[PDB]
Amino acid sequence: MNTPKEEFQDWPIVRIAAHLPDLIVYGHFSPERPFMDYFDGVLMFVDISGFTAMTEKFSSAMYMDRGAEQLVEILNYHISAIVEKVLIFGGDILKFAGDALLALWRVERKQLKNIITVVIKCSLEIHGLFIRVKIGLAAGHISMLVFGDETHSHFLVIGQAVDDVRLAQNMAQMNDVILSPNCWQLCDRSMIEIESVPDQRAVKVNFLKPPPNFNFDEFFTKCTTFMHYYPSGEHKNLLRLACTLKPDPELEMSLQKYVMESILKQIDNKQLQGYLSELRPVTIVFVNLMFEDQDKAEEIGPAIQDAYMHITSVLKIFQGQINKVFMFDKGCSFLCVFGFPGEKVPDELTHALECAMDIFDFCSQVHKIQTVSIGVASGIVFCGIVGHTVRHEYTVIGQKVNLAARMMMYYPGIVTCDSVTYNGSNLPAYFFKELPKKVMKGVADSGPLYQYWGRTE
Amino acid sequence: MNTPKEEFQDWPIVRIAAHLPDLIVYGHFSPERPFMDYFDGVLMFVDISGFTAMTEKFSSAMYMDRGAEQLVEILNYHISAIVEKVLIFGGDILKFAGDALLALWRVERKQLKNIITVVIKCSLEIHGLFIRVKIGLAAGHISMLVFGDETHSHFLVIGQAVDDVRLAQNMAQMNDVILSPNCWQLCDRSMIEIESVPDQRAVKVNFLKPPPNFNFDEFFTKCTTFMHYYPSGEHKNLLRLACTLKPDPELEMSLQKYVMESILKQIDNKQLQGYLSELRPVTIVFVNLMFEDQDKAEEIGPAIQDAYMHITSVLKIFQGQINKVFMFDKGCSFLCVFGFPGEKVPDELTHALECAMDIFDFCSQVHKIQTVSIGVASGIVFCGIVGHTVRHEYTVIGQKVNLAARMMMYYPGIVTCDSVTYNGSNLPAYFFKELPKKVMKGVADSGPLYQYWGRTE
Amino acid sequence: MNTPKEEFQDWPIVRIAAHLPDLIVYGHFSPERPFMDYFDGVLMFVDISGFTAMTEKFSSAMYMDRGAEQLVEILNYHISAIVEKVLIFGGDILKFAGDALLALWRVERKQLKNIITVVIKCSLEIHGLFIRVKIGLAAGHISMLVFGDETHSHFLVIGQAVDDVRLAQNMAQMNDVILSPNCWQLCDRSMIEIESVPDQRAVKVNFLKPPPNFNFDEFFTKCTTFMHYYPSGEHKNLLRLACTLKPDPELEMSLQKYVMESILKQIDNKQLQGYLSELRPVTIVFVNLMFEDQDKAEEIGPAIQDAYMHITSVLKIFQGQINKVFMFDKGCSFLCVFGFPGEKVPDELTHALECAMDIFDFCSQVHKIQTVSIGVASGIVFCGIVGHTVRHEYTVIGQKVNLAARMMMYYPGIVTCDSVTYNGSNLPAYFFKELPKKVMKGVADSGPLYQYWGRTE
Ligand SMILES: [Cl-]
Ligand SMILES: [Cl-]
Ligand SMILES: [Cl-]
Ligand SMILES: [Cl-]
Ligand SMILES: [Cl-]
Ligand SMILES: [Cl-]
Ligand SMILES: [Mg+2]
Ligand SMILES: [Mg+2]
Ligand SMILES: [Mg+2]
């Protein structure tokens, strides 16, 4: 009796799970919204610098109209290698945002110290492989928030360790690995050799200096005891346990809610893969919500849900999409896009502005939202699936993405727009106000910037 | 000198052969029609109960418009496992019909007794893996009929063993394996422990009770001597020898005639795979032809060919397709569909009715057809490729499929239709007659049913 | 710590490289045009006879509109096997043209004699596998020319060895391997048993007669010292080193210039694979340029570039494409096609004729072009990707392709067209002249042939 080869089955549930972390795939939590949970872990925020520039260059004539295809190929080639290292070292990639990603090693409190050594080692091997890579690490208490409606779900992580990992990463120079103060306080200092950072309590890693008799492969093995989904045994040749997920319509119904419809179309083999890699003109609407205490999920969770319910209803009407949500700019940011594959309306600019205004007015009166700020910017952006075959997400990359984010941060409390949006919109000039030009971290020169003052006053 | 890896080649001929049994793939018989052949074997009819209900549920809002994709995934996950067991145990899957399949172990007469033990073991391992599975087994003489025209071919098996396997399967309770009386008469009774079945000569299998020294792997090995296409040697890692078929335009011309054009389009990479999995509104026209003696291929073969020639010409004109033909309802049944992927006409209902009438009038005068009965039912049905990668077929599943079949059986000798068809058709009310409602095995409640009386009388 | 399987990555650069030889993939030469380089090697020209006939047969009704799919399948099945043998024996496939291919073993001069024995052995194993295969071999000095503009590149090989391999191949009878005189002069005659060929200095191979103690596997191993890209070590399971190419946007920009846009669309997963295999009506415009000395790249290179610049600009305007360029008919031939996938214009015939005339007038005054001849023929031709997964190219095959080539050769110095083109064009009868019918090698019977005299005279 034969025992024939069983070919890998790439069921749709498995394809869906590539778009999500283990935190969601294996989370099985309640469908109530908001839902919050609490745990401890180590975070790694990894940023490839330079892709934002490459993006502008990939529009030039030398790319012969295959800029999008060439960009995504060279991006994924690099990001794939970073993803593999993260996964092999036992991390869970939570989210990709542009040319950056955030990874989590969730463990019990007693295990943080040892897992920090694992993540440092991982970081040093990533910084090794290689555009510059910058890595921020943090460790401690972490909250998760899941919010949404009956057809869409989103998650975010929240708390001091989350704020820290982003602060740590911004201090990083080309190729630095930076530890948050708490991470440094919790790590095995007898092994980790650091320099201090000026006017900063975070530290920089110089190297690992293991003691005699220390064997990293053995230490790692001990650490895998604490890793719930590390591939092992018959599945030790796989990068993710999620590669083994079997059809389950209840689970798939729950997981699909996190993935955009156009991605589900590709997964379902109802649209060519090539279709979603593009360099296309879009409008970015970047919404920031600030709270009195951005580390307190039980306060901010309801407010985020409330804002989300309104945001999604106005985006439906003005035809936009939420690409990504994350904690950023001392608050919760929604990266919204008008003109994704299949949503290209005319009057996109006008609508992006009226939508931004509606969101601004409504969110300003949600309880516990202290300040709303929205940046609107338009131009050619890269849209596509970024990452590894086994772990990847749809994202946007471009100078207008960064501009919209910087606008919302440097012009808090108002709706701002760039010149392309201003000039191209339908709206009368006196609905706007020309603003003082600010020097903005990561921005060569915006043309003129404007406040969208709106119809009255 | 290198000896590089030879990658599997998925030539179009190999893709075509997934849609057919070995009985056809390796049959090399005459292209004359009808063609009949005669042999002996064991039949296994396997039915997954419950998918017909799942189908209705997969239309609900909770599936978020991915019902078809979710249905086919969970269906194939289960059916795939059953297919693998059948193939590993040396069976040839002849046909899929909805959530059921029919498999054949063709052998010489002297080998039936031993092969029955093999098939029982297979059945018990299938009933093991697991919606309820019901299995009917029969053994004996089998006739094959191939009918068609110069561009299309169809086959069917015929005879007492075929009638038996279907009778045996209908008696099965959830998870029973039932043997036909002849199978029980031919099997190795010293090994097989049964209970009797009330007012029935068929029996139920309780278990295999092998004698001392009996080793199933050795016994199976002996039995493979009689299996012409069991994968072996260098190909013992394959589920089917047909996976090794090499391009041959004469063979491919002959095999393609059994596969619908829209499936050939997908095989040819001229249409996305996703395209053919759908939950779509269709009209089922289920035609039953009864003969004086439904076990006698030399009598019924010509008549079936004759009916087929007419059926296919009227379906071409009213725009329908033959999905499947099989012996059923004490006769030969054609499962015909109006509105498959690419054939969606307006006035589909009217046309389905006029086509049904034309087929009824013509077939009623074909010599040797005793009674024609046709059931017409309309609604949302699942259409898609069901089975394993290496062995799968396009099929339809749904409550309106079952209704059309039950109508043709419980209202013999006339053309009947459901309420959706009646109400939606173009035709005047007096072309119909409202019928007495019958209690119908496998039907909760049809709305009102009608006879299509037609234009005169 | 796991060491998971790394799946093959089929990056777009790797897909592009399937369409090119190692001579270009690993060439890294200047982007200036023309560019010429010089080396030595052995050439193998392999021709499958009979596919041109098969092509006409695959249009008949018996193929049920899947002629194109069936033709390409049976063609690639055979050509694939020849490609594998060439690659395993260390050859570089330079180009496919219809059902023929040209392969190169580039080496230093001292190594020609040994490499000739390798290529003879290869040839004998190819002639073995098997429509008739005919093989011509030549050896000596070879020039390469790369020509083009800022978005398109083409290469060609030139010189006496190139003329020889084509002459040798035309003398071959069914299943002969023929050596050019120089190849025979350079080979290891103590091992190679030949017959002479009448009124010919080329010879035919009867067999390899190795001496005692000669071991082909050891000899081959020694010879691989001289083969720069022979897959070895960790990559010895691959048919081509190019299968390992990694993303590199500079390299990909340079390589894509050789591949047509519609092929890049498929590579980019923006078009279904099936789309480019077709039997479609096209117009072939076959341009031949003769020079005083067709073996002298430094003279003819500039002229070819000059002609190319004009040809490509008129083809853009009359909507045609260069399919292939190669030395042929004592000159440089451009195989141009009107009506490829996506370029089907109305008045295609008229335009093909006016384009042919423009090219004829311009090329006749390029310095160093002695004679221009152009054959125009229209009908159903096979268009598709021919070859092996790892090495394949888009090509055209058909009786009208061969007719256009024979016309340009047998009616030098003028533009000629077939009857389909004449009758179907828009143009007045007196723009043409009906020509004397010539007996043409490889042509059963053209209908009437015409000169396109043009508007004046
Ligand atoms: Cl997050
Ligand atoms: Cl998100
Ligand atoms: Cl059947
Ligand atoms: Cl059938
Ligand atoms: Cl060439
Ligand atoms: Cl070429
Ligand atoms: Mg970045
Ligand atoms: Mg059923
Ligand atoms: Mg040829």
Side-chain angles (χ1 to χ4, degrees), chain A residues 1-328 331-436 438-440 442-454 456, chain B residues 1-328 331-436 438-440 442-454 456, chain C residues 1-328 331-436 438-440 442-454 456:
Chain A
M1 191 142 42
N2 304 340
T3 50
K5 224 241 210 212
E6 80 197 311
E7 303 281 309
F8 160 61
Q9 252 297 128
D10 199 35
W11 296 112
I13 196 171
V14 169
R15 296 179 166 195
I16 294 168
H19 291 263
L20 298 166
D22 301 337
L23 177 70
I24 301 302
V25 172
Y26 292 111
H28 294 92
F29 36 72
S30 160
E32 96 200 74
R33 303 291 182 257
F35 168 76
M36 287 83 77
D37 205 10
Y38 299 94
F39 51 85
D40 293 281
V42 187
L43 293 165
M44 175 191 280
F45 188 111
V46 188
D47 180 42
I48 300 290
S49 172
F51 265 94
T52 296
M54 292 216 83
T55 304
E56 186 98 353
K57 220 231 153 166
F58 285 96
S59 286
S60 72
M62 66 171 59
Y63 289 93
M64 289 171 290
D65 306 315
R66 284 187 66 259
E69 292 78 12
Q70 281 248 50
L71 183 62
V72 77
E73 180 181 16
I74 192 57
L75 179 62
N76 288 347
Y77 175 54
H78 291 303
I79 287 173
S80 277
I82 297 175
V83 168
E84 293 207 355
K85 285 270 186 211
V86 171
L87 296 179
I88 285 160
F89 274 77
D92 189 12
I93 293 159
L94 300 184
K95 206 163 280 174
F96 300 80
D99 60 6
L101 63 84
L102 176 68
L104 170 64
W105 285 253
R106 183 183 174 161
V107 283
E108 296 292 327
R109 190 78 197 177
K110 301 336 159 68
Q111 286 312 316
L112 290 175
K113 165 182 280 168
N114 289 160
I115 292 293
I116 293 167
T117 287
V118 171
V119 181
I120 292 177
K121 185 64 207 277
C122 183
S123 298
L124 293 173
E125 299 201 1
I126 286 163
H127 137 246
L129 297 161
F130 307 136
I131 76 103
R132 332 257 71 183
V133 189
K134 301 187 209 73
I135 298 177
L137 302 183
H141 299 312
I142 296 162
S143 300
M144 179 200 12
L145 168 73
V146 181
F147 63 93
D149 65 20
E150 286 211 32
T151 68
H152 293 110
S153 295
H154 299 267
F155 78 98
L156 283 178
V157 290
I158 287 160
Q160 196 59 55
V162 176
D163 309 335
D164 286 349
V165 78
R166 305 200 65 103
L167 293 169
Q169 197 265 337
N170 296 331
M171 302 174 208
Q173 318 279 277
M174 320 128 298
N175 291 277
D176 286 352
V177 172
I178 303 300
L179 313 179
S180 70
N182 199 46
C183 183
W184 165 237
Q185 196 64 52
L186 290 171
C187 76
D188 182 350
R189 299 159 161 200
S190 69
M191 286 223 215
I192 297 164
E193 205 65 33
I194 66 74
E195 327 163 21
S196 91
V197 171
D199 305 313
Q200 277 307 337
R201 294 176 53 266
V203 287
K204 174 172 163 197
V205 179
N206 298 321
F207 50 110
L208 278 188
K209 166 113 177 259
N213 288 167
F214 175 86
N215 179 291
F216 184 81
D217 294 348
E218 293 170 358
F219 176 77
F220 186 85
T221 294
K222 297 187 168 212
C223 290
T224 60
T225 292
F226 307 104
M227 291 172 195
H228 194 152
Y229 316 109
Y230 201 66
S232 295
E234 177 60 34
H235 297 306
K236 82 179 201 294
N237 55 309
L238 300 178
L239 283 168
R240 297 184 73 196
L241 183 71
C243 302
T244 66
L245 275 185
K246 300 306 177 189
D248 176 349
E250 289 285 342
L251 185 50
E252 181 163 327
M253 265 185 291
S254 153
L255 301 183
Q256 74 155 79
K257 291 185 165 89
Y258 295 86
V259 179
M260 69 174 60
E261 280 78 4
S262 67
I263 290 280
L264 291 174
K265 205 176 180 184
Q266 175 190 127
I267 281 172
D268 287 331
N269 300 320
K270 287 181 163 74
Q271 172 182 287
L272 295 159
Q273 315 172 53
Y275 181 89
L276 283 174
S277 292
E278 311 172 55
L279 276 167
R280 69 196 270 107
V282 298
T283 302
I284 306 299
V285 175
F286 221 138
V287 181
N288 181 246
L289 314 174
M290 295 187 254
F291 307 91
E292 182 149 41
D293 187 339
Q294 69 170 327
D295 292 340
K296 188 160 177 181
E298 61 265 44
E299 300 279 316
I300 80 174
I304 293 165
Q305 168 71 22
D306 291 353
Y308 165 85
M309 294 298 287
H310 187 79
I311 286 162
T312 189
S313 69
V314 311
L315 286 182
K316 207 187 139 201
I317 287 170
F318 298 107
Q319 315 198 251
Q321 300 207 239
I322 293 173
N323 175 251
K324 213 64 76 165
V325 192
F326 41 76
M327 302 296 300
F328 184 55
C332 181
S333 298
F334 290 73
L335 188 182
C336 307
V337 181
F338 289 76
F340 270 156
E343 262 218 311
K344 254 286 187 341
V345 203
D347 280 288
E348 166 174 298
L349 292 187
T350 300
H351 291 335
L353 289 171
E354 292 166 335
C355 179
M357 188 59 77
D358 183 323
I359 289 163
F360 179 87
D361 289 335
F362 179 98
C363 298
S364 291
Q365 305 182 315
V366 175
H367 194 227
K368 279 145 175 165
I369 300 185
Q370 212 151 257
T371 312
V372 184
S373 311
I374 309 183
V376 185
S378 318
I380 303 297
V381 164
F382 170 73
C383 303
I385 295 165
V386 173
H388 189 289
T389 300
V390 306
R391 185 77 190 84
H392 54 204
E393 290 171 4
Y394 193 72
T395 197
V396 293
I397 298 173
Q399 284 177 188
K400 298 289 174 141
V401 184
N402 293 7
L403 178 63
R406 299 301 173 267
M407 291 160 68
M408 98 193 165
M409 295 166 30
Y410 282 76
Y411 295 92
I414 64 170
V415 178
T416 52
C417 76
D418 62 359
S419 210
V420 170
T421 304
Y422 167 77
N423 283 132
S425 64
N426 260 303
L427 300 162
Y430 55 86
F431 277 34
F432 307 82
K433 177 194 175 173
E434 189 185 7
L435 301 165
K438 291 170 182 193
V439 199
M440 274 191 299
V443 172
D445 190 291
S446 52
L449 301 180
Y450 301 87
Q451 178 176 5
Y452 186 56
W453 190 274
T456 297
Chain B
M1 191 142 42
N2 304 340
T3 50
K5 224 241 210 212
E6 80 197 311
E7 303 281 309
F8 160 61
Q9 252 297 128
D10 199 35
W11 296 112
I13 196 171
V14 169
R15 296 179 166 195
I16 294 168
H19 291 263
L20 298 166
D22 301 337
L23 177 70
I24 301 302
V25 172
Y26 292 111
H28 294 92
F29 36 72
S30 160
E32 96 200 74
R33 303 291 182 257
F35 168 76
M36 287 83 77
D37 205 10
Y38 299 94
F39 51 85
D40 293 281
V42 187
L43 293 165
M44 175 191 280
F45 188 111
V46 188
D47 180 42
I48 300 290
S49 172
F51 265 94
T52 296
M54 292 216 83
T55 304
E56 186 98 353
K57 220 231 153 166
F58 285 96
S59 286
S60 72
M62 66 171 59
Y63 289 93
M64 289 171 290
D65 306 315
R66 284 187 66 259
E69 292 78 12
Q70 281 248 50
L71 183 62
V72 77
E73 180 181 16
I74 192 57
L75 179 62
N76 288 347
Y77 175 54
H78 291 303
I79 287 173
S80 277
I82 297 175
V83 168
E84 293 207 355
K85 285 270 186 211
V86 171
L87 296 179
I88 285 160
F89 274 77
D92 189 12
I93 293 159
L94 300 184
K95 206 163 280 174
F96 300 80
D99 60 6
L101 63 84
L102 176 68
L104 170 64
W105 285 253
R106 183 183 174 161
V107 283
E108 296 292 327
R109 190 78 197 177
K110 301 336 159 68
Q111 286 312 316
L112 290 175
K113 165 182 280 168
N114 289 160
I115 292 293
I116 293 167
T117 287
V118 171
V119 181
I120 292 177
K121 185 64 207 277
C122 183
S123 298
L124 293 173
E125 299 201 1
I126 286 163
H127 137 246
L129 297 161
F130 307 136
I131 76 103
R132 332 257 71 183
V133 189
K134 301 187 209 73
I135 298 177
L137 302 183
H141 299 312
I142 296 162
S143 300
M144 179 200 12
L145 168 73
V146 181
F147 63 93
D149 65 20
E150 286 211 32
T151 68
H152 293 110
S153 295
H154 299 267
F155 78 98
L156 283 178
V157 290
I158 287 160
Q160 196 59 55
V162 176
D163 309 335
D164 286 349
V165 78
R166 305 200 65 103
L167 293 169
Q169 197 265 337
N170 296 331
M171 302 174 208
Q173 318 279 277
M174 320 128 298
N175 291 277
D176 286 352
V177 172
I178 303 300
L179 313 179
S180 70
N182 199 46
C183 183
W184 165 237
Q185 196 64 52
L186 290 171
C187 76
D188 182 350
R189 299 159 161 200
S190 69
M191 286 223 215
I192 297 164
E193 205 65 33
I194 66 74
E195 327 163 21
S196 91
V197 171
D199 305 313
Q200 277 307 337
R201 294 176 53 266
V203 287
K204 174 172 163 197
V205 179
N206 298 321
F207 50 110
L208 278 188
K209 166 113 177 259
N213 288 167
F214 175 86
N215 179 291
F216 184 81
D217 294 348
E218 293 170 358
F219 176 77
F220 186 85
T221 294
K222 297 187 168 212
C223 290
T224 60
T225 292
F226 307 104
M227 291 172 195
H228 194 152
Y229 316 109
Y230 201 66
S232 295
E234 177 60 34
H235 297 306
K236 82 179 201 294
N237 55 309
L238 300 178
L239 283 168
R240 297 184 73 196
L241 183 71
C243 302
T244 66
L245 275 185
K246 300 306 177 189
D248 176 349
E250 289 285 342
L251 185 50
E252 181 163 327
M253 265 185 291
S254 153
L255 301 183
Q256 74 155 79
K257 291 185 165 89
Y258 295 86
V259 179
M260 69 174 60
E261 280 78 4
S262 67
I263 290 280
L264 291 174
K265 205 176 180 184
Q266 175 190 127
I267 281 172
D268 287 331
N269 300 320
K270 287 181 163 74
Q271 172 182 287
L272 295 159
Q273 315 172 53
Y275 181 89
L276 283 174
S277 292
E278 311 172 55
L279 276 167
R280 69 196 270 107
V282 298
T283 302
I284 306 299
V285 175
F286 221 138
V287 181
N288 181 246
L289 314 174
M290 295 187 254
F291 307 91
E292 182 149 41
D293 187 339
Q294 69 170 327
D295 292 340
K296 188 160 177 181
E298 61 265 44
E299 300 279 316
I300 80 174
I304 293 165
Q305 168 71 22
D306 291 353
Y308 165 85
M309 294 298 287
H310 187 79
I311 286 162
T312 189
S313 69
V314 311
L315 286 182
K316 207 187 139 201
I317 287 170
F318 298 107
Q319 315 198 251
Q321 300 207 239
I322 293 173
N323 175 251
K324 213 64 76 165
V325 192
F326 41 76
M327 302 296 300
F328 184 55
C332 181
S333 298
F334 290 73
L335 188 182
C336 307
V337 181
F338 289 76
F340 270 156
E343 262 218 311
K344 254 286 187 341
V345 203
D347 280 288
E348 166 174 298
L349 292 187
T350 300
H351 291 335
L353 289 171
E354 292 166 335
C355 179
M357 188 59 77
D358 183 323
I359 289 163
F360 179 87
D361 289 335
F362 179 98
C363 298
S364 291
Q365 305 182 315
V366 175
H367 194 227
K368 279 145 175 165
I369 300 185
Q370 212 151 257
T371 312
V372 184
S373 311
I374 309 183
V376 185
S378 318
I380 303 297
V381 164
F382 170 73
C383 303
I385 295 165
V386 173
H388 189 289
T389 300
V390 306
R391 185 77 190 84
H392 54 204
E393 290 171 4
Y394 193 72
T395 197
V396 293
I397 298 173
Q399 284 177 188
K400 298 289 174 141
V401 184
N402 293 7
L403 178 63
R406 299 301 173 267
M407 291 160 68
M408 98 193 165
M409 295 166 30
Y410 282 76
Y411 295 92
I414 64 170
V415 178
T416 52
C417 76
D418 62 359
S419 210
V420 170
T421 304
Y422 167 77
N423 283 132
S425 64
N426 260 303
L427 300 161
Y430 55 86
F431 277 34
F432 307 82
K433 177 194 175 173
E434 189 185 7
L435 301 165
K438 291 170 182 193
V439 199
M440 274 191 299
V443 172
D445 190 291
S446 52
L449 301 180
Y450 301 87
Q451 178 176 5
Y452 186 56
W453 190 274
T456 297
Chain C
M1 191 142 42
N2 304 340
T3 50
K5 224 241 210 212
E6 80 197 311
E7 303 281 309
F8 160 61
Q9 252 297 128
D10 199 35
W11 296 112
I13 196 171
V14 169
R15 296 179 166 195
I16 294 168
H19 291 263
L20 298 166
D22 301 337
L23 177 70
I24 301 302
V25 172
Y26 292 111
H28 294 92
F29 36 72
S30 160
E32 96 200 74
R33 303 291 182 257
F35 168 76
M36 287 83 77
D37 205 10
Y38 299 94
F39 51 85
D40 293 281
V42 187
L43 293 165
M44 175 191 280
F45 188 111
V46 188
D47 180 42
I48 300 290
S49 172
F51 265 94
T52 296
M54 292 216 83
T55 304
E56 186 98 353
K57 220 231 153 166
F58 285 96
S59 286
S60 72
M62 66 171 59
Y63 289 93
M64 289 171 290
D65 306 315
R66 284 187 66 259
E69 292 78 12
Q70 281 248 50
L71 183 62
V72 77
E73 180 181 16
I74 192 57
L75 179 62
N76 288 347
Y77 175 54
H78 291 303
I79 287 173
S80 277
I82 297 175
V83 168
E84 293 207 355
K85 285 270 186 211
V86 171
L87 296 179
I88 285 160
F89 274 77
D92 189 12
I93 293 159
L94 300 184
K95 206 163 280 174
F96 300 80
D99 60 6
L101 63 84
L102 176 68
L104 170 64
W105 285 253
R106 183 183 174 161
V107 283
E108 296 292 327
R109 190 78 197 177
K110 301 336 159 68
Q111 286 312 316
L112 290 175
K113 165 182 280 168
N114 289 160
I115 292 293
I116 293 167
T117 287
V118 171
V119 181
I120 292 177
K121 185 64 207 277
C122 183
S123 298
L124 293 173
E125 299 201 1
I126 286 163
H127 137 246
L129 297 161
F130 307 136
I131 76 103
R132 332 257 71 183
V133 189
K134 301 187 209 73
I135 298 177
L137 302 183
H141 299 312
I142 296 162
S143 300
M144 179 200 12
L145 168 73
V146 181
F147 63 93
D149 65 20
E150 286 211 32
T151 68
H152 293 110
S153 295
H154 299 267
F155 77 98
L156 283 178
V157 290
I158 287 160
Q160 196 59 55
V162 176
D163 309 335
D164 286 349
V165 78
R166 305 200 65 103
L167 293 169
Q169 197 265 337
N170 296 331
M171 302 174 208
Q173 318 279 277
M174 320 128 298
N175 291 277
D176 286 352
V177 172
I178 303 300
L179 313 179
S180 70
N182 199 46
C183 183
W184 165 237
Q185 196 64 52
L186 290 171
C187 76
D188 182 350
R189 299 159 161 200
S190 69
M191 286 223 215
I192 297 164
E193 205 65 33
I194 66 74
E195 327 163 21
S196 91
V197 171
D199 305 313
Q200 277 307 337
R201 294 176 53 266
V203 287
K204 174 172 163 197
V205 179
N206 298 321
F207 50 110
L208 278 188
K209 166 113 177 259
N213 288 167
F214 175 86
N215 179 291
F216 184 81
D217 294 348
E218 293 170 358
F219 176 77
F220 186 85
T221 294
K222 297 187 168 212
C223 290
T224 60
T225 292
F226 307 104
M227 291 172 195
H228 194 152
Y229 316 109
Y230 201 66
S232 295
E234 177 60 34
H235 297 306
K236 82 179 201 294
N237 55 309
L238 300 178
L239 283 168
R240 297 184 73 196
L241 183 71
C243 302
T244 66
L245 275 185
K246 300 306 177 189
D248 176 349
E250 289 285 342
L251 185 50
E252 181 163 327
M253 265 185 291
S254 153
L255 301 183
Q256 74 155 79
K257 291 185 165 89
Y258 295 86
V259 179
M260 69 174 60
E261 280 78 4
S262 67
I263 290 280
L264 291 174
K265 205 176 180 184
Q266 175 190 127
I267 281 172
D268 287 331
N269 300 320
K270 287 181 163 74
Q271 172 182 287
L272 295 159
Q273 315 172 53
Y275 181 89
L276 283 174
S277 292
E278 311 172 55
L279 276 167
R280 69 196 270 107
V282 298
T283 302
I284 306 299
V285 175
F286 221 138
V287 181
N288 181 246
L289 314 174
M290 295 187 254
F291 307 92
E292 182 149 41
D293 187 339
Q294 69 170 327
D295 292 340
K296 188 160 177 181
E298 61 265 44
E299 300 279 316
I300 80 174
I304 293 165
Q305 168 71 22
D306 291 353
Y308 165 85
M309 294 298 287
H310 187 79
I311 286 162
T312 189
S313 69
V314 311
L315 286 182
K316 207 187 139 201
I317 287 170
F318 298 107
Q319 315 198 251
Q321 300 207 239
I322 293 173
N323 175 251
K324 213 64 76 165
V325 192
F326 41 76
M327 302 296 300
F328 184 55
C332 181
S333 298
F334 290 73
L335 188 182
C336 307
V337 181
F338 289 76
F340 270 156
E343 262 218 311
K344 254 286 187 341
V345 203
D347 280 288
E348 166 174 298
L349 292 187
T350 300
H351 291 335
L353 289 171
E354 292 166 335
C355 179
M357 188 59 77
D358 183 323
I359 289 163
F360 179 87
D361 289 335
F362 179 98
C363 298
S364 291
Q365 305 182 315
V366 175
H367 194 227
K368 279 145 175 165
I369 300 185
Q370 212 151 257
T371 312
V372 184
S373 311
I374 309 183
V376 185
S378 318
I380 303 297
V381 164
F382 170 73
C383 303
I385 295 165
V386 173
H388 189 289
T389 300
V390 306
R391 185 77 190 84
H392 54 204
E393 290 171 4
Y394 193 72
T395 198
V396 293
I397 298 173
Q399 284 177 188
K400 298 289 174 141
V401 184
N402 293 7
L403 178 63
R406 299 301 173 267
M407 291 160 68
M408 98 193 165
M409 295 166 30
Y410 282 76
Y411 295 92
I414 64 170
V415 178
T416 52
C417 76
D418 62 359
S419 210
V420 170
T421 304
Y422 167 77
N423 283 132
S425 64
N426 260 303
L427 300 161
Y430 55 86
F431 277 34
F432 307 82
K433 177 194 175 173
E434 189 185 7
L435 301 165
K438 291 170 182 193
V439 199
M440 274 191 299
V443 172
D445 190 291
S446 52
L449 301 179
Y450 301 87
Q451 178 176 5
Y452 186 56
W453 190 274
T456 297

